[PDB]
């Protein structure tokens, strides 16, 4: 599924991402846009053989196991295939551990290069929330 900006903003607010660890909802929507372009099936393979899955491009060498990434730490103790669902639930759950683990939203490269320091609330204004 390829969410629409406001559609995803709504679905993320419903999963309590708003102000999670103090991160306003705009951050999570902005991160999603430059990570997966809102595509829940997006999967990008990396040079080290690992792959980034889902709406929040979670990596397979550290967060999820996809069965083909040697050394997978699988920190979110979940398969990667579970992150390609139209239901962002699994992704949000994992995304929450990554953040509460002290990594912050820095863990997301796209967030640090395209959202951090900008007026992130622009990403949700004009939305029925």
């Amino acid at each position, epitope marked *: 599924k390829v969410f629409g900006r406001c559609e995803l903003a709504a679905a993320m607010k419903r999963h309590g991402l708003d102000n999670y660890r103090g991160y306003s909802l705009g951050n999570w929507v902005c991160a999603a846009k430059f990570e997966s372009n809102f595509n829940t099936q997006a999967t990008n393979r990396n*040079t*080290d053989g690992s792959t980034d899955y889902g709406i929040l491009q979670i990596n397979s*060498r*550290w967060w999820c196991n996809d069965g083909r990434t040697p050394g997978s*730490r699988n*920190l979110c103790n979940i398969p990667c295939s579970a992150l390609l669902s139209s239901d962002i639930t699994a992704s949000v759950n994992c995304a929450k551990k990554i953040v509460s683990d002290g*990594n912050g939203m820095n863990a997301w490269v796209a967030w640090r290069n395209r959202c951090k320091g900008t007026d992130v609330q622009a990403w949700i204004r004009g939305c029925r929330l």
Partner: nanobody
Amino acid sequence: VQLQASGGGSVQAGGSLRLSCAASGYTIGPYCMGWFRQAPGKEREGVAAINMGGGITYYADSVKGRFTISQDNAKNTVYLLMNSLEPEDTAIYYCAADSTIYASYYECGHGLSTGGYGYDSWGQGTQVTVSS
């Protein structure tokens, strides 16, 4: 956490040296380990980095082909093999790690060549001196 570096010393131009660095006190990670060097009158230069586990490497243009960095059996220890050392290579070498476990793929050489951004843990510098 603590970074333990060893090796280095003095050597004649053309010789080789091998530095090593041991990260201690990590539950997970580090994600990146690399080396920075500071010579007198010059800017702090990022020399080499590697994505822990994944093994992917990055090198400054000034040491490409001469230096080689590697990991040791995921033992959280990395080595820096320096060949064709020249006196310009004379400097203080620092071992550094990036403790963040990124969600999406991250290339360690990126922060390496942009002020060491992301590398939050540094070790005691080690003097390397290449004489003529």
